[PDB]
Amino acid sequence: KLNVSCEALQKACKLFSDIAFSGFSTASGK
Amino acid sequence: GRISTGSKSLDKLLGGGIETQAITEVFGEFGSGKTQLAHTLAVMVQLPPEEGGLNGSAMYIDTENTFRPERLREIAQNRGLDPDEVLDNVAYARAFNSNHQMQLLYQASAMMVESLDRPYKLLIVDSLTSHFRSEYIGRGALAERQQKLARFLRMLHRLANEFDIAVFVTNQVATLRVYLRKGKGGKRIARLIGEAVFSITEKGIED
Ligand SMILES: *CCc1nc(CC*)nc(N(C)CC(=O)O)n1
């Protein structure tokens, strides 16, 4: 499982501003 | 820099291979080597520049049940790499529908900004129009279909330049376009929109 912090996530919302689901995991299932 | 494809003739056609801050879009049918090239690139990007890589991690968004981690191990092992480390440096997310695909990009962006040590340097989308073409049917739905696809494409270009990553996507019949076709047995030919011939092998894609 590959998780991401709410701080990093809210920065990405600013990036796509002018424009829960399953996320990502490694090819080894983590 | 540029991510090498493993095929010296294909790298020549692309001018040093696929490039960051750009979107390379391959076209063709089942067996032309679109997914085969995508799995190879996911391994290549992990190598240092002398080998044809960028010392980076990869992201694979799958929308057509094409992801095979066994092949990644096969390529990495044959190319002289720890297939256990290669597998750890490939993030994967199966998109279930168009909306999931769009949301996965935010997840990718956030993971990319954190990665900035092996930072993510390649994003693979296979396929790209599958969900869009399977959910929006007819002329009356074409306007919304073209709009969503254009929005996704805009988000993709944004990440490519924002995090200096390379975006490789697949499609069937703004971006750097390539067409793939089958040839002599396992041999495949690539043509830009003049031609290069590569072969699918145990090490992935090569002359
Ligand atoms: C960046 C988009 C986003 N992510 C989160 C979680 C970090 N939360 C928001 N909000 C607007 C807060 C909320 O749920 O009310 N937006």
Author numbering:
A (entry chain C): 1226 to 1244, 2054 to 2064
B (entry chain A): 111 to 226, 229 to 285, 309 to 328, 336 to 349
Q: How does the study describe this entry?
A:
RAD51 is the central recombinase enzyme that catalyses mitotic homologous recombination, a key pathway of double-strand DNA break repair. RAD51 is regulated by a set of conserved ∼35 aa long BRC repeats located in the BRCA2 tumour suppressor protein. BRC repeats bind the C-terminal ATPase domain of RAD51 via two conserved tetrad motifs, FxxA and LFDE, each located on eponymous sequence modules. As template, we chose a previously identified high-affinity shuffled repeat BRC8-2, which binds a monomeric construct of RAD51 (HumRadA22) with a low-nanomolar KD and inhibits RAD51 oligomerisation on ssDNA in vitro, and for which a complex structure has been determined.
Model stapled peptide SP2 was designed by introducing two cysteines at the α-helical, C-terminal LFDE module of the 38-residue template. The designed cysteines replaced solvent-exposed residues i, i + 7 positions apart in a classical helical stapling fashion. A different linker (DVP) was used to cyclise SP24 and SP30 instead of DVT, which was used for SP2. All three peptides SP2, SP24 and SP30 bound with similar low-nanomolar affinities in ITC, and the binding appears to be slightly weaker relative to the linear BRC8-2 template. In the lowest resolution SP2 complex structure, the DVT linker appears as a poorly defined “blob” in the electron density located mid-way between the two cysteine sulphurs. In both SP2 and SP24, the linker moiety lies in an unoccupied region between the side chains of endocyclic n + 3 and n + 4 residues. The helical geometry of the C-terminal LFDE module is not perturbed either in SP2 or SP24, with near-identical distances observed between cysteine α-carbons compared to the corresponding residues in BRC8-2. The Cα RMSD of the superimposed helices from SP2 and SP24 relative to BRC8-2 are 0.235 and 0.310 Å, respectively, indicating minimal distortion by i, i + 7 stapling. All three stapled peptide structures have broadly similar binding modes to the parental template, with FxxA and LFDE hot-spot residues binding to their cognate hydrophobic pockets. However, the three stapled peptides do not display the extended β-hairpin observed for the BRC8-2 template.
